[PDB]
Symmetry: D2
């Protein structure tokens, strides 16, 4: 288990931005700007800094050209400059590698701490950021698929309980999770800002980044992204969805960028900010837990995820999950899922729902 | 080939209602009234008469208790009372069995003709119907999933060109179809009322009724139906969707009633009323023709459909399709589909899209 | 009274396009293309030809540069080439001035007949038109405010029953109307294509063109047009709405182009194609008849409308309405409206709803 | 000026519920339940306890029968039981009257403090509450107009800067405000939970309660409430909207309950939780500030608001505003409003936008 430091945890406000390494900056720009409509805060020949429609901080997404596509940092904003000091002391006590730069790692961010966290992920903590024009009423720019906020990250890690304890000590509260009747945890979601999540853990080989999620205002905005991708004849880059989530209750869609980084589009989860917010636990065999409508979860969603980098820019070695696999127990050859607990009708043995096999 | 009568075709306005035989009336009522929110026009111990939010004719759906679930009649409204006489002469010349009831077959319909049509389907033609309160501004009754109009039927039949020519003679205009390069037709959509379809032909063993479709105002109304079915823990009765259609461009969902009758929910297709409305042909291997987003079509959509009855209420014998199977050529072991024509990236060989066999 | 000809009426399919004269073509282009997102079929220094997202005929709107902003033609497509000949005979029997051009008045239209109709309006009838790429699945182009179809026209004319009868003889069927208890008709809506209207008559001094209406898919598309106009700091060009209509049950908005031509954005009216479609008559004092939510009807809606041209391009003289004014009887100083018939609560006397009088 | 106490402010989570006094409990139930679709947690002959679709605390609204319709309490939930003690000490240092009930003022709330705050408003602070079934995935119950959360309160008070400083010391952050070029503040919005507001101050005679706001998921849910009010032939109870706000950028509607308590329906404001969230100041003469589309603000919006009670249940005396009136300076006789700053075209002199004047 990861011990709880004597040192006070930093006060984390929210997920704020991700830095993604991409291999072809122009192809990535085309996806994130021309297809998805994100707004350019700054760009040059090496990097593109993008923000959502309602953001005032410098960016939500940095695309950095590099040789290997990977997550380089997932950044959380802290409440005060002094919280960056707290973050540094906290991670030093945990025995984690840290690097602090008073003028930031990327443009538009000031004093920042990056760490290789106990699960192998590159976390950044910062307060100082360059404010930009908040585009929230720029309806002259508004896309029919407009991405309005950064919502969350989702991480793949082999041991969910181990990770969950560490994030709870850091101040995240678990909102929903997935378990079985045999003591296995498959996933958990946890928050600071009072939505279902700021980061989440998905059981699997890791460290890998499962996805970065952006919000829309309404469900039709998500539909429009799918319609546009059909019109562009890139529907093969729609991985899963659209649907209603069980966990989170949000309307959702998963798409893949040119380097196969998975982006979720997400809307209309619920308020979690009360400290006794009731925690919802689903059974892993409940076929409405991921897609509420019982639509099958494609195996690539379980198996594929992005590499992550260490502070030297090198790919982190992947550690294999030894706990049961959600894929195997639900849609594999010996898998099972149900629609109604205890009802054989609407249950699936050794295959996925709605008529499909792997 | 089905010859064109010399008798003038009835002037058909639109699809108007279906009569479905159901085995358990209370269970069926629960689905159509309590789940789907259709409005009761009349009921007793034997039948439930239901209508959509914007309808003024007596009903769009009649549920009739019987021993074997099946389509008993698919009904079209005609322009004038004299068009029922035309329909009778027309089908008599075709050599079809007909039955005329001057006082109707079901409540709220007057003078009506039922026929066993040349494709084996029980069609009704009528003009006279009891007007009821049009609920189109009754927002005090409006459901988050409200079904606002009856939109179309879809029929499974073995020989699509044969059926298409028969429907064209009857005045239906083809709007869209699916074909391959060898010249096989897999499906056609055709209309009277100036939408993408009033009835449609799906290639397969028939006569069987593929579905009845109702429209909503907006796409979120369809999402709500899915969400409601999840809450009621009957998500297993969501067969396919929700999705954007390629053919028709409509947003869609397919669900199954307690007797496995398939209901489509549908919104936002386009205007087809001009006589030179451009006809759209899709290639059968195009993975965006059915679901525009490339989601796979579940095999049950191609294989399962409702029995239909003859005028004595016995189940109509089925004729097997001998033309190529859309299932087999797209998602079966020797099938294939593409995202971009001529591109192996985003193509699927011997399985369906998105990772599924 | 306008007589019914012996000659058969042409079979009219639908409203198809309007030709509007505009005074500054670049300013008008900015409005219809950059603000509203209509699609250009053809343009030059003299004209801009525009279509909606789902259209396959050549255009829904022609902007023609000229000295005096006005309606030059409201055009209906007919079912067959021969229906143009029927239109010509029909209007010649009515004693109307007609002009026939075998190769069209505007680009992308073939054989066409323009008439100065018995109410002074320039109608066009045509069958032949150049087909274009139907953009209905071009979601790479789709705007958050996308205009998907042309829906209808609305005409201001002093004597509504006189015009209604003439349109009925032409095959248009009345769907809804607005009357009072003492027999005055204020407005009527009438269709060919199976929606609430293809053209409509608003009582007032005329001939003038009240508006041209385009459809969206959903209500939020209309909300976006408002939002965008706020962002562009042209909210003063939002005239009325958005709202829910009583008559038609459609969600709506009225906006003004650079020459004050009024454009309606409209969605989700109901099917009227059955021949016994039930007609709906509203009382003029029913404050839910126009805006169903009871929001006040802005006075310019009742007073302002576009000039129309005759076949020489000169403005048609205006004839004054002598029947009662809807403005006056509902929101003027002697006006009244109700929420519930017979209830003083929720009634308005000498002013509009929601606490406003006329400015 | 209201001094900053030495005692630490309670840690406030969010607005949580209001208790409104109503004169006819059945008529009020018809409005909030049958019209608006709120969910009944408990009721009897004297009270109705209601909650929104996504709520897990016992209620968001208590309707209490009494002789005079009024706000009885606006309630904020605090982070810990100990914050109720902090609240008591804080308000005692402010010199305010307070009342502490270990088992609650209303059913489903435990240990609770009510205070007559420095602006004369009855605030409640509590932590303990009975959890109920959270209905957030009960789509079998979901209405076409479903109210999904309680969002905020809005208070009418004569001196906005005085109130603003007090609420800032209590830890609310101002997100937007309306001012003019001559030093007057007409309104301010302020939050704890990371939306545009939890409570707000509107300049006017007070203390009075301007509104309680509930949110929906989507704009069409707000359209449906209007549509249903039309079908029920109660469109006279739609006061203002629907619209897009300038302040907050939310889609909105204002409606009136049977006692004229004003309810806002609200959706799709933006995230404010960062501590340096940019404060937006609108000029009072900007005609897109309140309705972004420039629709005129109905005069009753500026003049009418609910009475509020003291801790004895008596109506609080009203103190008149002496600062300039937003109504007067925008749509009154000497009013002015603009569409584009510095452009005469689209400006309005001595009347409202869109062709309207103030009714007599
Ligand atoms: O299978 C598909 O998705 C094509 C399709 C289009 C329109 C319809 O009404 C329908 O039932 C089926
Ligand atoms: O004024 C109103 O609100 C009534 C009305 C209904 C339908 C329309 O198309 C229209 O232009 C006007
Ligand atoms: Ca001043
Ligand atoms: Cl999921
Ligand atoms: Cl406001
Ligand atoms: Fe996610
Ligand atoms: Fe269909
Ligand atoms: Fe109109
Ligand atoms: Fe408010």
């Amino acid at each position: 288990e990861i011990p709880k430091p004597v040192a006070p945890a930093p006060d984390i406000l929210r997920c704020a931005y991700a830095e993604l390494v991409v291999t072809d900056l122009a192809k990535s720009r085309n996806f994130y700007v021309d297809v998805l409509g994100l707004h350019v805060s700054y760009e040059d020949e090496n990097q593109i800094y993008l923000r959502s429609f309602e953001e005032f901080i410098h960016h939500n997404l940095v695309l950095t050209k590099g040789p290997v596509a990977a997550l380089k940092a997932m950044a959380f904003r802290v409440r005060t400059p002094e919280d960056v000091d707290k973050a540094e002391a906290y991670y030093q006590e945990l025995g984690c590698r840290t690097e602090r730069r008073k003028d930031g790692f990327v443009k538009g961010i000031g004093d920042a701490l990056r760490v290789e966290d106990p699960l192998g992920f590159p976390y950044e903590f910062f307060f100082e950021t360059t404010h930009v024009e908040r585009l929230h009423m720029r309806y002259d720019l508004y896309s029919a698929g407009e991405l309005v906020r950064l919502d969350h990250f989702n991480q793949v890690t082999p041991d969910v309980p181990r990770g969950r304890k560490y994030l709870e000590d850091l101040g995240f509260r678990v909102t929903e999770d997935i378990q079985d009747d045999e003591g296995t945890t498959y996933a958990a979601w946890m928050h600071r800002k009072g939505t279902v999540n700021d980061t989440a853990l998905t059981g699997g080989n890791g460290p890998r980044l499962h996805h970065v999620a952006f919000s829309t205002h309404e469900k039709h905005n998500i539909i429009q992204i799918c319609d546009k991708m059909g019109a562009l004849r890139i529907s093969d880059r729609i991985e899963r969805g659209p649907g209603r989530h069980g966990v989170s209750n949000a309307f959702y869609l998963y798409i893949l960028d040119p380097d196969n980084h998975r982006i979720e589009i997400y809307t209309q989860d619920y308020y979690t900010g009360d400290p006794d917010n009731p925690t919802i636990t689903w059974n892993v065999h409940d076929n409405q837990r991921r897609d509420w409508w019982g639509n099958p979860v494609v195996p690539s969603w379980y198996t594929e995820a992005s590499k992550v980098l260490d502070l030297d820019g090198n790919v982190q070695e992947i550690i294999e999950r030894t706990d049961d696999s959600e894929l195997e127990v639900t849609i594999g050859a010996d898998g099972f899922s149900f629609t109604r607990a205890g009802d054989e009708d609407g249950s699936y043995h050794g295959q996925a729902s709605k008529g499909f096999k792997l």
